[PDB]
Amino acid sequence: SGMQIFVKTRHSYKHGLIENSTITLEVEPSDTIENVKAKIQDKEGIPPDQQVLIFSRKRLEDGRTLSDYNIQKESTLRLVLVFGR
Amino acid sequence: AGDESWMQREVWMSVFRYLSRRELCECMRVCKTWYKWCCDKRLWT
Amino acid sequence: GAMPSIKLQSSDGEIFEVDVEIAKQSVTIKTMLEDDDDPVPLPNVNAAILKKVIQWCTHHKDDPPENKEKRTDDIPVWDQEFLKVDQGTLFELILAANYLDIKGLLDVTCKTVANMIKGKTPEEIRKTFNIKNDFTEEEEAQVRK
Numbered sequence: 427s428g429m430q431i432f433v434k435t436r437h438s439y440k441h442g443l444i445e446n447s448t449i450t451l452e453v454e455p456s457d458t459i460e461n462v463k464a465k466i467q468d469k470e471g472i473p474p475d476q477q478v479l480i481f482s483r484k485r486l487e488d489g490r491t492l493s494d495y496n497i498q499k500e501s502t503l504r505l506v507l508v509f510g511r
Numbered sequence: 512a513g514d515e516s517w518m519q520r521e522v523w524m525s526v527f528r529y530l531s532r533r534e535l536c537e538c539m540r541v542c543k544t545w546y547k548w549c550c551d552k553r554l555w556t
Numbered sequence: 557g558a559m560p561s562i563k564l565q566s567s568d569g570e571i572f573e574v575d576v577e578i579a580k581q582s583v584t585i586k587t588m589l590e591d592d593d594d595p596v597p598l599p600n601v602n603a604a605i606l607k608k609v610i611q612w613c614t615h616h617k618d619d620p621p622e623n624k625e626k627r628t629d630d631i632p633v634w635d636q637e638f639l640k641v642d643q644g645t646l647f648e649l650i651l652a653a654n655y656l657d658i659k660g661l662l663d664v665t666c667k668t669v670a671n672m673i674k675g676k677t678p679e680e681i682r683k684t685f686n687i688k689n690d691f692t693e694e695e696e697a698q699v700r701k
Binding site: 442509510 | 518521
Binding site for chain 3: 436438444478480482483484485506507508509
């Protein structure tokens with residue numbers, strides 16, 4: 427799939443107890459942040475409207491690509507789980 | 512307080528760790544969600 | 557001169573500068589510093605909640621860090637007055653202290669809520685937290701078996 431990046435999480439979504447874990451995603455440099463969140467929903471079940479992703483202390487806006495943030499192979503994003511609406 | 516969100520679940524299950532066996536047995540009667548969170552094999556050991 | 561500090565950015569946008577050793581009461585933040593001098597985003601903690609977190613950590617600045625019987629009557633007097641806030645604020649204080657992993661702040665906050673359940677009927681807990689009774693009459697009998 428081109429690249430593999432890492433997302434470290436700290437949330438309680440699986441069973442109800444907060445916990446740390448790093449997950450691996452297969453990505454393209456062209457992939458949009460929406461697509462990255464959709465791939466997080468596939469393995470984690472968290473809806474995209476409840477995900478916020480951060481790279482190097484910068485909040486990643488949806489309609490942009492990973493190359494726009496220069497998110498390369500084996501880069502690490504941060505997943506913060508937030509409230510619905 | 513009675514919603515079935517991940518926020519309500521993280522809070523009350525964090526709270527249920529500080530409840531004794533007596534206060535847990537009275538929380539199971541509040542609502543259907545509390546009954547389910549109070550009946551997990553981690554609060555009774 | 558000054559001392560190393562870190563900036564935290566609430567979900568609302570407000571940025572809070574906190575002394576590092578006070579911030580390292582949060583193990584979640586302590587690990588980030590162990591591994592850009594822009595603020596660290598906390599998109600799950602709004603400004604009011606983060607304001608009260610910093611307040612709690614500043615007051616417990618000089619405190620040194622069980623699996624026994626449960627006690628909830630041992631909240632220091634300052635924390636009890638500080639935790640006289642609405643239910644929603646307490647619920648968000650447990651969320652923030654859990655995410656930031658501040659054991660002391662999560663302990664007093666959950667014990668505060670636990671004290672609003674102690675000695676109350678299930679009906680009294682419902683009135684306290686405005687929880688509706690989603691039980692059917694037959695379901696409320698099986699629970700009481």
